[PDB]
Amino acid sequence: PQITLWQRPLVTIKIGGQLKEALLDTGADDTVLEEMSLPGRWKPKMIGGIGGFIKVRQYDQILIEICGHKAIGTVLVGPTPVNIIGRNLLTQIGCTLNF
Amino acid sequence: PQITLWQRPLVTIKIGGQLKEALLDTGADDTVLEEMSLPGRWKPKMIGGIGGFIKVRQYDQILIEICGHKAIGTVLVGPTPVNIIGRNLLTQIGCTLNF
Ligand SMILES: CC(C)CN(C[C@@H](O)[C@H](Cc1ccccc1)NC(=O)O[C@H]1CO[C@H]2OCC[C@H]21)S(=O)(=O)c1ccc(C(N)=O)cc1
Q1: Where are the domains of chain B?
Q2: A residues 11..70 contacting B (CB < 8 A)
Q3: Which end of chain B is more exposed for a tag (fewer CB within 10 A), N or C?
Q4: Do A5 and B54 touch (CB under 8 A)?
């Protein structure tokens, strides 16, 4: 799809067998999801954004279907206010910015 | 232009007579720039992101040229780690997401 930006670019994702909504976020390097149950082992990490930092669990090689496009990569899990799909996954689904 | 997302989508902006680089950020509702000198009146606001909230100064009707495309809108100024161009301005320069 082409998506205009008059509203938040929210899409449905399927991850770890669960359905969620997440924001297509070109300002995020990596994908960050609110606390949820995920299969893997994981590694502790810190990520920083606008108002400081949060602690996340880093899960590698996780499958996500983003509007019915499959991608596999790193997902960070933690106390983000919003599920964010970052460039690490956007590149796999062929997402570009056009102006 | 069309912009792929293998690297951060940084563009040059001209604002307040100054040249800066900023991230085209579909995950941001509003535009947030690091501390800089801007002409005019402004109103205190707080905005929240990944790790909490920062206090910003809200400037309305500010002119920005983003890759040589002119837009006028709200610009928030404050301790963001990176200059961010948000959807409030992305819509004016005709920016879309495509996959
Ligand atoms: C500040 C940018 C450069 C990085 N962020 C991505 C942004 O798009 C971030 C995504 C987001 C976070 C919290 C709530 C809602 C949206 N946008 C965001 O901070 O936007 C600000 C300004 O505009 C406002 O609307 C949304 C909340 C407000 S981030 O903090 O969420 C982030 C940081 C690090 C990483 C990482 N290590 O991969 C991933 C994402």
Answers
A1: 1-99
A2: 23-29, 32, 47-54, 67, 69
A3: N
A4: no
CB of B91 less than 8 A from some CB of A: yes
- For this experimental structure, what is the resolution in angstroms? 1.8
Fold of A1-99: Cathepsin D, subunit A; domain 1 (2.40.70)
- DSSP code for A87: H
Provide residues with CB under 6 Å of ligand 1: A 25, 27-30, 32, 47, 49-50, 81-82, 84, 86; B 23, 25, 27-30, 32, 47, 49-50, 82, 84, 86
Give the neighbor-by-neighbor strand order of the sheet with B2-3: A2-3, B96-98, A96-98, B2-3
Contacts of residues B34-37 at CB distance under 8 Å and 24 or more positions apart, as own/partner, are B34/B77, B34/B78, B34/B79, B34/B80, B34/B81, B34/B82, B34/B83, B35/B77, B35/B78, B35/B79, B36/B77
Q: Could you say which of A80, A87, A94 has the minimum Cβ distance to residue B50?
A: A80
| A66 Cβ contact partners less than 8 Å away, ≥ 6 residues apart | A11, A13, A22, A24, A85, A89, A93
CB distance B97 to A97 below 8 Å: yes
Determined by which method?
Answer: X-ray
How many beta carbons lie within 10 A of that of residue B27, not counting itself?
Answer: 23
Residue in the block written with tokens 């006028």: B72
